Amino acid sequence: QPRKKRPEDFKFGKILGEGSFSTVVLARELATSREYAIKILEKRHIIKENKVPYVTRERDVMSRLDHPFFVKLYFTFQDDEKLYFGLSYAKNGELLKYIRKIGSFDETCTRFYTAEIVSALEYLHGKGIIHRDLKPENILLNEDMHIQITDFGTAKVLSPRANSFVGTAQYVSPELLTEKSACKSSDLWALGCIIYQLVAGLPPFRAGNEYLIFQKIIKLEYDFPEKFFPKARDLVEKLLVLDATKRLGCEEMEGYGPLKAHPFFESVTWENLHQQTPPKL
Numbered sequence: 587q588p589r590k591k592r593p594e595d596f597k598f599g600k601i602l603g604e605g606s607f608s609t610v611v612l613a614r615e616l617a618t619s620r621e622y623a624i625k626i627l628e629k630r631h632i633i634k635e636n637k638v639p640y641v642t643r644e645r646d647v648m649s650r651l652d653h654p655f656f657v658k659l660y661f662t663f664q665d666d667e668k669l670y671f672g673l674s675y676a677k678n679g680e681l682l683k684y685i686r687k688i689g690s691f692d693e694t695c696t697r698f699y700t701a702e703i704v705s706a707l708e709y710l711h712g713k714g715i716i717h718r719d720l721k722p723e724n725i726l727l728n729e730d731m732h733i734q735i736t737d738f739g740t741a742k743v744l745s746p747r748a749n750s751f752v753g754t755a756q757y758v759s760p761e762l763l764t765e766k767s768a769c770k771s772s773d774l775w776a777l778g779c780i781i782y783q784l785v786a787g788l789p790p791f792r793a794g795n796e797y798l799i800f801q802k803i804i805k806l807e808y809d810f811p812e813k814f815f816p817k818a819r820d821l822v823e824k825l826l827v828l829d830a831t832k833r834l835g836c837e838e839m840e841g842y843g844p845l846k847a848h849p850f851f852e853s854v855t856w857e858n859l860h861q862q863t864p865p866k867l
């Protein structure tokens with residue numbers, strides 16, 4: 587392998603963003619000119635807050651992925667105080683940004699981006715991995731305007747780490763609120779919310795606070811605005827179903843075939859999405 591990288595191998599630049607346990611900073615590797623988004627984690631804080639399982643899962647899960655719709659973990663290293671993860675730098679930011687910028691998507695853009703998310707989830711669930719925090723904030727856009735999903739510390743790798751995390755309120759599935767249990771279904775729920783959000787401009791469950799959002803979720807209290815692309819409404823209704831075993835994409839619903847075969851995706855070529863030019867605003 588290459589020599590372990592070190593802080594002194596890079597010129598660190600702008601902070602991209604800041605979380606409770608990490609900071610992502612853009613970094614230029616002196617020896618190659620390459621730019622990376624390096625996620626930097628203070629070891630003390632991770633230890634104090636019992637987060638080693640999560641930091642260990644993020645590295646381990648990202649290390650196992652090898653597909654263009656995910657952020658790549660290129661390297662890791664550490665000094666006495668911090669850990670460093672060398673990630674892809676997605677130049678065009680998060681999908682959330684793009685949703686806020688251009689407002690709601692026309693059907694062509696909705697379809698294209700929905701198809702890349704479905705195709706990514708198919709890859710992920712095939713490896714027996716659940717994301718658990720799928721939302722537009724963590725679906726990045728690369729330079730060529732294809733998706734790159736990130737944020738895997740909170741993921742779950744399935745059996746043959748059970749039910750401790752709950753993602754962003756607006757995307758939380760009913761089964762997380764009623765059971766102590768994450769399943770592939772929960773990602774498919776979040777997918778339904780994301781499709782609704784691309785079309786509508788806002789997510790389907792909204793209120794003043796998290797308690798009120800959760801009450802709406804368990805009662806399935808949401809509505810479609812009037813011009814909502816009909817086949818997309820049909821797809822969303824087949825995902826935002828309280829019975830987790832009855833969501834399109836689930837093993838009990840015969841898998842990703844039926845989901846990919848929905849009318850909404852009739853014009854999609856599923857075989858080489860990453861090779862296709864994305865529609866442009």
Ligand SMILES: CN1CCC[C@@H]1CCn1cc(C2=C(c3c[nH]c4ccccc34)C(=O)NC2=O)c2ccccc21
Binds near residue numbers: 602610675723724
């Ligand atoms: C986690 N943050 C919440 C708000 C901004 C950021 C978005 C989620 N996110 C982007 C990440 C990444 C990138 C970011 C790209 N723009 C960002 C802005 C703030 C924070 C991170 C990024 C990137 O270029 N490559 C990434 O993996 C990222 C990496 C690990 C865990 C979460 C990550």
